[PDB]
Amino acid sequence: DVRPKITLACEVCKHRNYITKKNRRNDPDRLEIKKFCPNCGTHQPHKES
Amino acid sequence: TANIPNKLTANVRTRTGKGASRQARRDGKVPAVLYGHGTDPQHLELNARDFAAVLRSHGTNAILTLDIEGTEQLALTKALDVHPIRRNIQHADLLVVQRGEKVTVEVTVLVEGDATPGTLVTQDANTIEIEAEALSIPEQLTVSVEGVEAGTQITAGQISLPEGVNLISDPELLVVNVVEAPSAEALEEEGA
Amino acid sequence: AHKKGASSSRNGRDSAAQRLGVKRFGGQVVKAGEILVRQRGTHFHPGVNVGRGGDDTLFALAPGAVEFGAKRGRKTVNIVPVARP
Amino acid sequence: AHKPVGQNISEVRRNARLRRHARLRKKVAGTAEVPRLVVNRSARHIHVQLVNDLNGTTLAAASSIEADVRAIDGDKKAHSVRVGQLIAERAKAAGVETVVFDRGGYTYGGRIAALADAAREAGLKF
Amino acid sequence: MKTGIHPEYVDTTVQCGCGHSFTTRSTKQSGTIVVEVCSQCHPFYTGKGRVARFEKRYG
Amino acid sequence: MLIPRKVKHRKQHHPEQRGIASGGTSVSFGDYGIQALEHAYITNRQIESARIAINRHIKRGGKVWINIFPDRPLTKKPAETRMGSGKGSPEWWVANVKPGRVLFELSYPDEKTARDALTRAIHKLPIKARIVTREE
RNA sequence: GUUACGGCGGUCCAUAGCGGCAGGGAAACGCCCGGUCCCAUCCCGAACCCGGAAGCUAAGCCUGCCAGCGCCGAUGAUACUACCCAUCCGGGUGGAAAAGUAGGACACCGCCGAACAC
RNA sequence: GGUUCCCUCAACCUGGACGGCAAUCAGGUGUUGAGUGUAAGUGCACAAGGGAGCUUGACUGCGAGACGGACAUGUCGAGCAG
């Protein structure tokens, strides 16, 4: 839907920590972002579910 | 030019304001201000009938001799406040001068004569700026239009001035513009 | 004249009033964090002990009395440290 | 007769440096407890000051004009280190320990950086 | 001057038919070029083989 | 008839009719003029009728100036309709006149014909007026 | 303490600006000479950076004098206005502009540092 | 978007192969008349406008003091810890 809602999950513990939007035509591939994960307690890579 | 100054009587204003100037004008006086190089403002009162009498026969730039509480002062008429409808004189700015002092004065120009029959005489500049000493301001400068034909321009540089009189306004102003007489087919085409 | 048609107005919209303006005037004694001026741009710039919000709202950074000044042609809002009794 | 047509390179350098010095001043301010450290790099010498912007008065100031600094036989960078040590001694003797660096509109590096690194090594904390 | 973006720039010399010679620097990797008209040869700078076969037939 | 080439806002409030004129109260181009004495809206259909009455009385010679221009519009809504449902479309153009304002001017060689030519134009305007000159 | 001196600041940031004329290189501020060293150009040691000391005050900078352009601007009068009288006009008490006139003005104040002198 | 550093536009004049009013280049005048994703308004040349390098704070637990309000909503916020 051009700009759908996406959810970012930690790569270590796999907890859904954030939700955001991206353009699915400008950025067709799964987003990769470093975000603070409270469960781990530090900054871990996050990937689109 | 040699001018004889005109004697006037001036009285110091007791009050000032809009409620005291209306009383003065309802009585027959005009408020005035006598400032000048002396760094000394003064709020005066002149008789309305007497002040307008000299202006009717000596132009706007008259030379006054005010008698303020017994003394004698030489003054010049700078500006006048005239009501648009009643044609009154609501105020008068007076400037103190001395003999031999050069004053920049804006005098009026009158065109006289009868040009070519098939021509129309139009005046653009009503007045020009003139520098002269305090007792030698010409009350009028005249220009003659005679034998002038068709497109012709009597620019301000051709106006003759009395000896001892300079010219402040530059010689580029167009004073009189004489042109061909408009026909009946030209009066209808204008303004529509 | 006697003939008639259909007419209407395509206007008739507006938005809610925003209540923008000066909230604390010169000489008033304020606390810390108290909103002073609400505005769109920087019509008033911050001075000493005054910050700027996300929407260009000026608040007090320290207790004191409000002062209005100018600094190189910019209208600034300042806080003076009123002395303890 | 002669008449230059355009701006000299000295004219451009002078007022473009102050143009990017005033830009720096938007955040760096000098307090009596945390003074402001000015530096004026030149093609020949270097100067520093310890400025207080609330009073508009300076407390301490070292320079390379001094006959003691000229005794060093090193290069311009070696002359900058000594200035960086002179100012630290004069600042500490005035009861000043923490300062803020105002690079003066020059690129931080070379003689500018050599002065700051010597003052950090000699007590001043910035 | 940056390292790699620029091309080669090596010394060279120029010999011309009028006996004049040069020694300059350029990008010609050969290091020497030959020029048939130069500043010295050109008539315009001095104030002033089709014909070979043309004279080889008529005279 | 005079119409401006364009105006930003086509439907405007009514011009205020208070006070006397702040400027343009003297003759600047011609030798004679018409000075207003009360407030009114002077439509462009009365300006055109006034300057033709001047032209016919002087026939050939002389020049005519008009110092007021119909900028401001007035709107009339369609006939025989109730109140409400929008605002009417502009219908005629007016010029806010205040006492003291000089409307027309004229420069003609003699006096009688020039003075009587202006009186014919006064009888076409919805106001009272008088003839004024350049002298003090 | 003195100077045609060099930095850092200020003022309800032009009364300070623009322009014209004539002048200065003691120390400093600059132009200036190079690209071996840190560093740099979306190409160029032009700029940023570094190492210097042949020439010059021709420019920046600084000093003195000009009111041509900009800037500031009274007094008084007027427009307007609060309250009050006033049967359709107007008036009284208090406040008081904008434009314009006389004029002002080629800035003033503070902390350091230089050379000379003491 | 975050942050660090650097720059001044529009318009006009003059000289240039195609090239013209108007493309890329050079010099000069130029203090905001250009531009800010998107309406208008308030701002921004000190730049919030233009360029480049590294990055994800487009966070977690909180939040003194306030704006605005019939209520339900809505808005700003220094500062502490990770």
Add this chain to the structure above:
RNA sequence: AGGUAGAGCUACUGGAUGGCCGAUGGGCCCCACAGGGUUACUGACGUCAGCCAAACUCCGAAUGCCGGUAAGUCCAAGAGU
């Protein structure tokens, strides 16, 4: 702290009257290109003089509003919270 009444515009955005200047074009002669001038001209740019605006402003009051202070009414406003 404003921005109304007022006023002002060569201080921005628009409207707009009359002159002067004259590029450019139009039309013509300049035997055709090129090669100089003329018009009741459409006449840009500039400039002199007089103007207009709720959605224009280089300006700009009187009142009104927020706060402080000194008093006044005070066997009363029969006040505020």
